């Protein structure tokens, strides 16, 4: 056999030399050099050091500035929360696991590791479909007098958690399951064994269709809409109104956010589909370690894109960080927001 299937795992390594050992019971240094696990460990460490501050700061700024209440300000607050669950929820176990070369906490640690990374990536995916819509509704504007209230935003946000849970929670209760991958320091869905006892093959198709192919289609199609309408070609103050102008900006970002997602998840999803379609073949531990661990940057790139592509949020952050105010920068030239400063309501 090309690998070592276990009742709970599947090491992508032969046991012809009987050197293979349950990744819930002993180090896996026979799969790779010990320094490489240190790499994973060092890496998970730096990611937690970046992901915590960046996501918490994002979260703190959004709340403190009483005017940051657009559908986008919501979706990104949602993402910051989901990213903090990633950091504390599973990254703590993946660093702990990398440090020992195996899942000392056994399947429980594997479930934390798998669930939160899944929950996180899937909340991002669904939050992108919501943006695609909102994006659409504003650009190609379907109604002749409609506007997303905060309620809607909270709707979309609530929706992303139902959809993400629909995919991440099943494996914790008998449908498919989380199992260690690559150097066995991370945990994902089961694409390795057909384990009928927990109905793995069906869940995998359920996830690639309901939680992937489909949301992608929506998002892409929706784009093919904001193709003839709002385009990447973004000019200066007023595009037909400085209003319309700054509309082109949010869309440019929602589009970058999509590219960042694919870069981050296509390789993983790709290796994952392969394995599913080539169960038992001869792949090694590094095969999935690389995209699996690279995809964990998904807990941080969202806020970066946001702060770099949103003059208003960046300013509210500089305003916040600069303890007092003095949003130096160039401000937003347009609206601003905060708590006691110029968070002065100014609609109509
Ligand atoms: C790869 O081949 C190895 C040799 O066949 C095999 O080693 C076997 O590992 C088990 C661990 O479950 C040992 O069983 C021990 O189980 C408990 C320990 O808590 C006790 O009842 C005894 O101490 C018992 O020995 C086997 O002794 C051991 N057999 C050997 C070394 O020949 C690996 O498990 C195989 N890799 C896999 C499939 O994970
Ligand atoms: C172990 O892995 C090897 C290589 O991945 C598998 O060999 C392949 O077998 C398929 C048919 O199942 C052929 O289409 C390929 O051409 C084979 N490639 C090679 C390298 O010979 C092998 O099947 C696997 N063994 C199992 C079933 O555990
Ligand atoms: C490091 C831990 C990881 C990557 C744990 C598991 C992640 C998954 C099972 C992710 C699945 C998918 C996502 C988030 C994005 C769309 C494609 C997908 C279904 C492969
Ligand atoms: C960017 C998406 C990545 C898509 C995943 C490609 C899986 S490709 C697969 O990898 C194996 C490694 O053990 C090779 O042995 C095999 O020849 C190759 O076809
Ligand atoms: C089109 C691209 C959007 C891409 C954006 C950049 C935001 C990036 C952050 C990636 C996390 C890197 C972590 C280093 C840890 C060593
Ligand atoms: C105004 O004073 C100019 C901006 C300078 C602020 C320096 C930015 C340092 C970033 C550290 C913030 C970490 C957030 C805390 C998370 C717990
Ligand atoms: C509120 O306005 C304070 C700004 C918050 C960012 C923290 C800035 C730190 C100040 C610079 C410290 C220099 C480093 C010296 C190390 C010995
Ligand atoms: Hg769109
Ligand atoms: Hg990424
Ligand atoms: Hg602001
Ligand atoms: Zn079983
Ligand atoms: Zn989902
Ligand atoms: Zn199969
Ligand atoms: Zn500026």
From Swiss-Prot:
Record text on subunit structure and interactions: Homodimer. May form a complex composed of RHO, GRK1 and RCVRN in a Ca(2+)-dependent manner; RCVRN prevents the interaction between GRK1 and RHO. Interacts with GRK1. Interacts (phosphorylated form) with SAG. Interacts with GNAT1. Interacts with GNAT3. SAG and G-proteins compete for a common binding site. Interacts with PRCD; the interaction promotes PRCD stability. Forms a complex with ASAP1 and ARF4. Forms a complex with ASAP1, RAB11A, Rabin8/RAB3IP, ARF4 and RAB11FIP3; the complex regulates Golgi-to-cilia rhodopsin/RHO transport in photoreceptors.
Resulting phenotype, residue 2 to C: Stabilized by a disulfide bond and normal light absorption
Modified residues (N6-(retinylidene)lysine): 296
Cytoplasmic side: 62-73, 134-152, 225-252, 309-348
Modified residues (Phosphoserine): 334, 338, 343
Annotated localization: Membrane; Cell projection, Cilium, Photoreceptor outer segment
Cell membrane is among the record's keywords: no
Classification via Gene3D superfamilies: Rhodopsin 7-helix transmembrane proteins
PTM per Swiss-Prot/TrEMBL: Phosphorylated on some or all of the serine and threonine residues present in the C-terminal region. Contains one covalently linked retinal chromophore. Upon light absorption, the covalently bound 11-cis-retinal is converted to all-trans-retinal. After hydrolysis of the Schiff base and release of the covalently bound all-trans-retinal, active rhodopsin is regenerated by binding of a fresh molecule of 11-cis-retinal.
Database matches in SMART domains: 7TM_GPCR_Srsx
Residues involved in Zn(2+) binding: 201, 279
GO biological process: absorption of visible light; cellular response to light stimulus; detection of temperature stimulus involved in thermoception; G protein-coupled opsin signaling pathway; G protein-coupled receptor signaling pathway; gene expression; microtubule cytoskeleton organization; photoreceptor cell maintenance
Pfam families: 7tm_1 (PF00001), Rhodopsin_N (PF10413)
Region (Interaction with SAG): 330-348
UniProt keyword annotations, A-Z: Acetylation, Cell projection, Chromophore, Disulfide bond, G-protein coupled receptor, Glycoprotein, Lipoprotein, Membrane, Metal-binding, Palmitate, Phosphoprotein, Photoreceptor protein, Receptor, Retinal protein, Sensory transduction, Transducer, Transmembrane, Transmembrane helix, Vision, Zinc
Annotated glycan sites: 2, 15
Protein name, UniProt field: Rhodopsin
Intervals, Extracellular compartment: 1-36, 97-110, 174-202, 275-286
Effect in UniProt of substituting residue 113 to Q: Causes shift to the activated conformation
General function of this protein: Photoreceptor required for image-forming vision at low light intensity. Required for photoreceptor cell viability after birth. Light-induced isomerization of 11-cis to all-trans retinal triggers a conformational change that activates signaling via G-proteins. Subsequent receptor phosphorylation mediates displacement of the bound G-protein alpha subunit by the arrestin SAG and terminates signaling.
Family: Belongs to the G-protein coupled receptor 1 family. Opsin subfamily.
Encoding gene, per UniProt annotation: RHO
């Amino acid at each position: 056999m090309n690998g070592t299937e276990g009742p709970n795992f599947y090491v992508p390594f032969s046991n012809k030399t009987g050197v293979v050992r349950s990744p819930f019971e002993a180090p896996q240094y026979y799969l790779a050099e010990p320094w490489q696990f240190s790499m994973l460990a060092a890496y998970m460490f730096l990611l937690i050091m970046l992901g915590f501050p960046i996501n918490f700061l994002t979260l703190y700024v959004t709340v403190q500035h009483k005017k940051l209440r657009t559908p986008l300000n919501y979706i990104l607050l949602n993402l910051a929360v989901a990213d903090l669950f990633m950091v504390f929820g599973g990254f703590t176990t993946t660093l702990y696991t990398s440090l020992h070369g195996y899942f000392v906490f056994g399947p429980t640690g594997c479930n934390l590791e798998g669930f939160f990374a899944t929950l996180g990536g899937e909340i991002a995916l669904w939050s992108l479909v919501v943006l695609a819509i909102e994006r659409y509704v504003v650009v190609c504007k379907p109604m002749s007098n409609f506007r997303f209230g905060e309620n809607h935003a909270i709707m979309g946000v609530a929706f992303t958690w139902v959809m993400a849970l629909a995919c991440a929670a099943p494996p914790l209760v008998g449908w498919s399951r989380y199992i260690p991958e690559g150097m066995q320091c991370s945990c994902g869905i089961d694409y390795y064994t057909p384990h009928e006892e927990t109905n793995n093959e069906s869940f995998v198709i359920y996830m690639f269709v309901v939680h992937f192919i489909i949301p992608l289609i929506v998002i892409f199609f929706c784009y093919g809409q904001l193709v003839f309408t709002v385009k990447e070609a973004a000019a200066q103050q007023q595009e037909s109104a400085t209003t319309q102008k700054a509309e082109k900006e949010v869309t440019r970002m929602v589009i970058i956010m999509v590219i960042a997602f694919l870069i981050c998840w296509l390789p993983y999803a790709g290796v994952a589909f392969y394995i599913f379609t080539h169960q038992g073949s001869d792949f090694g531990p590094i095969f999935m370690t690389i995209p699996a661990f690279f995809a964990k940057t998904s807990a941080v790139y969202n806020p970066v894109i946001y702060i770099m592509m949103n003059k208003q949020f960046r300013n509210c952050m500089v305003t916040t960080l600069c303890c007092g105010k003095n949003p130096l920068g160039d401000d937003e030239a347009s609206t601003t927001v905060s708590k006691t400063e110029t968070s002065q309501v100014a609609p109509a």
